[PDB]
Symmetry: D2
Subunit: 449 residues, 4 copies
């Protein structure tokens, strides 16, 4: 310690630190404090002007002018944080985004689960055998031994390193022309040709191909077409890591603000959601755009209570409310939440997370999600919006560009016996690359009708 | 007289003047010579750099990279050469061009029957009552009296005036934003909504609407989208008018060339087509891009003979061969012509004129064309190209943006009793504005499959 | 007659026609009425959207964001209305405009004395020998005989024809790439190299050359650089010609307006300036942007009276006040006019006409202007603005791209004995092409300091 | 170990490893091998398409169409690798680049000493007291103790982390609009206003300000103006670190190549320059663009021998030869080197390093460089090129955006007693931020004449 914040925020800051943080690591305090003091001076993962630029883009999503595509790994691992893997995830993210853009007929803003998504809350404190379980590479190792599972503050520094590496690469990839949409559509036509249900989406695939041909015929210069913007996001979970990445930034107008520059967009989880707990108060204090995970037990009245705390100046696009209710309960629970939140005067982004609501333990033993149920939660998410006359702001999916077999269903007909063929996820099951693109086509079809 | 041309061309020029010109006016020579000497010094209707730019664009059409949309009034009249009329024709030309662009998936180059299309050859020398018939406003008046029907050299000057007025307006209209394609599509959706066979083209209309939305979502600046290029063309027919508009122009590289700057593109007619007559030799000598009307009696061997004379340096896009064979004879006659011309080493533009081949005298008395037969000649024109593996370069139609009833058929079901309701053409019957747009949709559908 | 205007304007229209028009032709009424009825239906020289676009650009000039370059022939002639002559005038206009743009560091909006500047008021009713003098090619011929000098209504139609020809060409020239500023600067460096006072402007010429190199080095696409906008203007003088070119136009918002579409910008002359005469009331009624010539006898109070009549809604850039006071009287008279007009709440364009104030009969007999005096009126025009803290809006000069010798002075040292070497003007003496470019450099230097 | 390279390169690779590397660290082999195996799988600092794009840009520099601005810290430190410091260096790099662009009248390609410049060769093996000296943060610590000075393989991983952090930030900064040249010029005018020799460069500063105003007046869209490309470079020195960052990359055409993706451009030093030593053979094998430091003892014949080895296919821009000869010896030695290298058929980039040739120990005790001598080596570098008629390709300077006092001279008159006021460099003395910008202005002035 040494630098104090300005007098408006310092009282609110100490008030925030004092709250109970759930899902935190048990480790040495003096050591973890040193790691935080080190990370207080490093280069941030993002810069304030990019966060301001995102808030303007997310305002367009809230007001109905754009769509939000968020997704990536469930949990990144240091082992998996490689050039081929990041390339593959960036590819599918963009490949989906172009199809989503055609269907929605609006800008698709691309957020990624990347450059920080290491912390993993989904766990019971202690595992079988009386051995503490894996809480993400920022806390401990995947190795099932008391040596590796020991909580290690140094992993915060390892995580920051891997985050800055990852974000460096996505910036590089996007500028160097792997986000050129003529090439992306060429890959999308290779998916449609080689998919078992290929002719079932070939109507829309040829139709996108016509619009891209049409663009070139009208004589447009690939000016904004040659490179795109992939923003980055993770669940703000570790008190130490997120408080270490706090930075001040003087706005170009004149006034200064406080950002958590660990990512562009941070989000609060289902388990860490308490109104008087740390994470909500941390969120309310930082000027980053913010998400909040919302499950079946949400009442309309406390969804408004969140919006009042997290969006205290009614800035459109600031708060994003993320429905993760399961395919059954989304039609039932959501309409009351939208009606009440809309009535209170908050233009939030209504985002669908059809992943963390539909997770079940299969007959095989492996944890899985069935594709058809994932799609159905989004199907019902749109139905709620169409019927209420509000704007479906975005999706939030967990995927990988690798040819893995973690979710059931899809075009390739992934059964229970296919699951141990290739399974690489650090926690939740993710959409196979085919299933990622297939989802995009169906969500595009939902955006049309 | 006073200026002689350079020694290469002067021998070829005098050789050209010496040939027989068919379809010429009977009038005073000394007087018509004065009119020509006056028009030798006026501003031209176009400038050489625009003609060079067209030859590059027409080369793309010949090599398969673009499409050619040519059309307008059959014969312009001084009475009809007005702001609302020219606007309407420019509108439909552009409205068609955008649909044709989507279907073809290539640039549609827009040529118009405008700014010079006054001469009209379709006539028997003398009419009933022993009274000379209307040969176009550049020769005599529409008024059915020996006073007005007298051949008047001064009408060449009147024609040049009206031409320069018309081309001034189309330039103005195109630059001032009546060629903004977002507005054009908004008019195309008003056509599809209000047409009796509206839902029969609404598949493609919504699909074009999606591509335009998609363009805006991808974040393209309306840079080349806000204004387009409409070129101008007429049938080079009057020796005096066309020889008066001859101009030299030093190319930016260094060498000089000889253009007939009465229009961008000139074309030779069916009646004026003799290999040793004036018009073909005039054409061969001028550096303008050139068309040539081709009917059923064409043999493959003399189509090659034309191409050798008119395109002596195998410049792709220079000659355009225009099939006007009738809906029956186009499948039969055309394949032999394409095979032979392609074999000889000439990349010409294969253009379809489904108008001047399908003209019949109706039971009413009025001269008409049936829509279905016009479409069918184009249908068969593409079939010949699809089967032979050559590129269908363009269409050549006669239309008007006015709500007139001159052709039978179409969506609105124009019968013989509808014909005297509104009939405004100086010679041939033209496509109703609905029929013009309807044709575009069907020719677009032919360009896809 | 047949069409009546809407009830707001019709009372004001008949009120306007009823006023005395000065400087009008003596000719047959029934005949001149026929000519007007003919011209009521022709294509206009410009279209309303271009006039609206100009009013927006002229608003930027009034508010200090841009400069106005107006100029061309003093009087166009049908004999002089040719491709080489129009090209030369368009060239110098643009060549000046690029230098003026660098000096002013703002957009130079290009207006031209073209496509209508045929009427010429500067004359005594009857000439020597009791023979009526030349009042411009729209009224009578230059030929010094009672045959040609007879006033001929038909010349209005001849004038419209020549106007539409001229404007067609300038549109063509500007779009076809003779307004590409890399080529224009290459011509400007040929002027500076070959001028006798070449090294006296070579500081600024190299400095403009550096900025153009710099533009290309920064990697700018010649998008708005390849083609420019030359607008057209003349003195609204003939009642018949100007009232015949009146057109209505529905604004894109909804409301309709009344334009004189003979040109983009019309202007009122010194002789035709009466507050209750025709021309001021005609001007006030038409939605075109308007100029008004102002000489030494102007009092500040009646300059405000004009502004209230001509700019009744305080639309910036609508009225342009044109100082033509002579090199001596401009410092004296102008400051009071600016102070009063600015105080009244009118953002007009303060334009300098250093031509029609400094015209004297030389010792040779020929009417001439001395270059140094022309420059000095502009020098003093800026001094008045610099001292008062107002914006010098533009210049208004009479020039020709031909190598003529009409004004004295300049770099080439044009004496009285040089004047009969080559003299081609229909009325006032014009700046030699060197003198035009030289003026631009000096006015640029005045715009800097 | 596990992956072998393709059979063309593997023989050349093992041949390269076998050579003597000078200036290497003494540390544990098995441990340093582990660090290398770890870094073999991480994300690279750059991607092959950016390196290809640089080689195209560096080809333009070699052929005379562009200039190369290389520079930054002499040695980066982990302590100094912060957001404010990197921002400051990026700022001055860009601020110089815009002035250099105006003077050169060509694209300035921006390379930086960043994201890897940690190794430092300038040292005697052992220091005073029998204690090993600082060889850069990638090898050991600055702390003057045997604990910190111990050679630590782990610092390679620390270095990679800090490199990926730095490059992430420069990418972020450049895209987020701190490379908008209107803002950069506003900072350049604040330098010129506040510099003691302010009016001595105010001629050029106003002249650049005029060109930027002119750009905006001509109506250019800030498309390529809003963001720029800063590439990254360091001295390829540590065998382990550089061999660990080797990656293969399939070219978009088809063929594959081998890059050291630790940076975009790598360069060989004066001490590590042996023709049969590791670094030259490593360089020759990698497809990165390559530099080579050249001092007074260079003979023309061995400069050709380098060029034949490093540029074996005469690819223009591939090799960059960097003259670091001192202000006296550059005029003498360089001309023979250029003549011979040019004669052999190699279009290399002739770059000037006026820093590492002019380093002397001052009377104070501190190591310094005098500004005037630095400038003079560049002055003579251009003189050699002007006289020989070859292209001066670029500069290579050591600077910092911090207000430090390390070099003598400049506008602020830095004497020996000023040196201990603020001195922050890990090795060589760097240009003060004023001295950096001042140098740019003078090198710009040299590029003009
Ligand atoms: N840069 C634009 C267009 C674009 C480029 N690549 C894309 C991929 C997907 C969607 C859009 C794009 C955007 O981000 O919207
Ligand atoms: N200027 C482009 C695009 C365009 C604008 N308006 C159009 C109307 C129809 C077809 C294309 C266009 C072109 O001529 O191709
Ligand atoms: N089109 C821009 C730039 C331009 C092109 N040519 C010019 C000639 C002179 C001045 C400006 C220009 C303009 O009118 O301002
Ligand atoms: N992007 C262009 C122009 C540019 C933007 N910022 C700059 C700063 C310096 C020099 C040039 C630029 C370039 O790199 O050349
Ligand atoms: Mn998950
Ligand atoms: Mn016809
Ligand atoms: Mn005059
Ligand atoms: Mn150094």
């Amino acid at each position: 310690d040494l630098p104090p914040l300005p007098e408006g925020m310092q009282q609110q800051f100490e008030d925030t630190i004092s709250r109970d943080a759930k899902q935190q690591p048990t480790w040495d305090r003096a050591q973890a404090e040193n790691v935080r003091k080190i990370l207080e001076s490093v280069p941030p993962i993002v810069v304030a002007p990019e966060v301001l630029e995102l808030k303007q883009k997310l305002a367009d999503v809230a007001n109905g002018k754009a769509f939000l595509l968020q997704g990536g790994d469930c949990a990144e691992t240091f082992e998996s944080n490689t050039e081929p893997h990041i390339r593959a995830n960036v590819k599918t993210l963009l490949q989906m985004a172009v199809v989503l853009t055609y269907g929605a007929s609006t800008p698709v803003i691309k957020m990624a689960r990347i450059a920080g998504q290491y912390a993993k809350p989904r766990s019971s404190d202690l595992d079988g055998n009386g051995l503490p379980n894996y809480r993400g590479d920022i806390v401990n190792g995947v190795e099932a031994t008391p040596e590796a599972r020991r909580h290690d503050p140094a992993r915060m520094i390892r995580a920051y390193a891997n985050a800055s590496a990852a974000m460096n690469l996505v910036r590089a990839l996007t500028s160097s022309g792997t986000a050129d949409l003529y090439r992306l559509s060429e890959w999308n036509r290779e998916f449609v040709a080689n998919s078992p249900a290929g002719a079932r989406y070939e109507a829309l695939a040829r139709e996108i191909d016509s619009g891209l041909r049409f663009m070139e015929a009208c004589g447009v210069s690939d000016e904004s077409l040659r490179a795109a913007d992939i923003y980055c996001s993770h669940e703000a979970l570790l008190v130490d890591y997120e408080r270490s990445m706090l930075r001040l930034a003087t706005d170009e107008e004149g006034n200064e603000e406080l950002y958590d520059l660990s990512a562009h967009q941070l989000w609060i989880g289902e388990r860490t959601r308490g109104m008087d707990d740390f994470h909500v108060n941390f969120a309310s204090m930082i000027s980053n755009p913010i998400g909040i995970k919302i499950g079946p037990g949400i009442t309309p009245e406390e969804a408004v209570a969140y919006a009042d705390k997290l969006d205290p100046n009614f800035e459109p696009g600031r708060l994003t409310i993320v429905a993760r209710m399961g395919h059954d309960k989304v039609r039932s629970v959501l309409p009351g939440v939208i009606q009440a939140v809309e009535a209170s005067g908050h233009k939030v982004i209504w985002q669908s997370d059809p992943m963390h609501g539909n997770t079940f333990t299969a007959s095989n033993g492996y944890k899985t999600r069935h594709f058809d149920k994932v799609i159905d939660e989004v199907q019902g998410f749109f139905e709620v919006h169409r019927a209420l006359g509000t704007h479906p702001g975005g999706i939030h999916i967990e995927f990988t560009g690798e040819d893995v077999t973690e979710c059931l269903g899809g075009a390739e007909d992934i059964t229970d016996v296919d699951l141990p063929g290739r399974y690489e996820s650090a926690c939740d099951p993710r959409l196979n690359t085919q299933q990622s693109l297939e989802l995009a086509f169906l969500v595009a079809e939902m955006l049309r009708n």
